[PDB]
Amino acid sequence: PPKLTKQMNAIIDTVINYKDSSGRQLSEVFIQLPSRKELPEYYELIRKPVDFKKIKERIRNHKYRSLGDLEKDVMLLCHNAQTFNLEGSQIYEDSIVLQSVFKSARQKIA
Ligand SMILES: O=c1nc2n(c3cccc(Cl)c13)-c1ccc(C3CCNCC3)cc1C21CCCCC1
Ligand SMILES: [Zn+2]
Numbered sequence: 001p002p003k004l005t006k007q008m009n010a011i012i013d014t015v016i017n018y019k020d021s022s023g024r025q026l027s028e029v030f031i032q033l034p035s036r037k038e039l040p041e042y043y044e045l046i047r048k049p050v051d052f053k054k055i056k057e058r059i060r061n062h063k064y065r066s067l068g069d070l071e072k073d074v075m076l077l078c079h080n081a082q083t084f085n086l087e088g089s090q091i092y093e094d095s096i097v098l099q100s101v102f103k104s105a106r107q108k109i110a
Contacts, residue, residue: 007109008059009059011109031052032051033049046083046084051077054073055070070106
C-alpha cells in the first residue's frame with residue numbers, strides 16, 4: 001500500500017483498538033451503523049451516517065486525499081455519536097475520547 005494508506009490505517013487502527021483502563025474497546029459500538037430498520041431514529045437525526053467500517057473502506061479505496069479528509073470523517077462519526085447519544089452517557093463521552101485519540105495518533109504517525 002502507498003505511504004499515506006499505511007499512515008491512515010495505523011491512525012484508524014489506534015482509534016479502533018483503543019481500550020480504557022478496564023480493557024473496554026471504546027470503538028466497538030461505532031464499528032457498524034445500526035440498520036435503518038433496527039434504529040430508524042438514528043437516520044432521522046443523522047444526515048450523513050458513517051461508521052469505522054466505512055472509514056476503513058474509504059482508506060482502502062484511497063478516497064481520502066489527505067489526513068485532513070480522514071480527520072473530517074472521524075470528526076463526523078464522533079459528531080454523529082454526540083448528536084444521537086445522550087449527553088453525559090458512556091457512548092457520548094467515549095466519542096469525545098476517540099476524537100482526542102485520533103488527533104494524538106495523527107500527530108504520532110504523521
Ligand atoms: O452514533 C452512534 N451511535 C450508536 N451506533 C453507531 C454506530 C456507528 C457509528 C456511530 Cl457514530 C454510532 C450504534 C450501532 C449499532 C447499535 C445496535 C447494536 C445492537 N443491535 C441494534 C443496533 C447501536 C448503536 C448506537 C446508538 C444506540 C445506542 C448505542 C450506540
Ligand atoms: Zn490500492
